[PDB]
Amino acid sequence: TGEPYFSHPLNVARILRRAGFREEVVVAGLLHDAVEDTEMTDADIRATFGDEVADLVASHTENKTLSWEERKAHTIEQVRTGNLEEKALIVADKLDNLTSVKYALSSKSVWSYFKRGYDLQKWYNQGIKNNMEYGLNPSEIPPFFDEYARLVKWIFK
Amino acid sequence: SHPLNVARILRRAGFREEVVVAGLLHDAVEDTEMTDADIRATFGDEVADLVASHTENKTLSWEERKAHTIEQVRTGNLEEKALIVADKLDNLTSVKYALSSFKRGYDLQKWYNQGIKNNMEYGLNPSEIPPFFDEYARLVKWIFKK
């Protein structure tokens, strides 16, 4: 994970803050990796940060007992049907991830880069890109959604 | 949500985001005993270093822990001082509202908060003191006037 904070949670929080999202949303973005990558749980988040943040976090957390294809399909459905905040949490997370991917590829064959393989990564990112605007009014789509779309088009053309 | 209020305090005062995040994470880190390695791998070295500056040794008595915090706010850098004071400001903000509409007792809370207030400015130039340090001093004075 690259600039400016050299930390995925800090960079995702910045994308959300700059897009105008309230503090509860920014913090939910910050805590995503804490829940998925450490022993911290949903109950720990509720006890310390409250139910609103805990619920925002839970909206994008993967159930790790499911296969990659199933976890990913569930995220696509959530980016389609969630509210603006829920959609933003998912897109911001993917945007920082693809930013690091573009950086790696700019030095590294896209057909050999992904451990889950190109086809699956393409299917996934195109799925987020093609569903993130569903049900949103043009005036509320965050500018960073366009940055993610451009990255998907660049990496998976 | 107290952590969010601590974040708001630090951000408004102009501190960099690593300090803001370290403030936000203080309770979570103590309530779950998250290791340095976990904080460091998840949030980065800058956040991890700041979080480590304000973590109490649970084996010592409450008074020993607090006395140590009082000495830390005296000798720490500006960011370390700010983390401690923001935490206490948030706490007292709640107490003041409840009192208008104490853990371990009044005498101990008074001793602790007066200690922070009386040592937070040590080693700083008047122009460096965040205005929220003054908000905190006023709360200590109003709450512990008896």
Ligand code: NA
């Ligand atoms: Na977890």
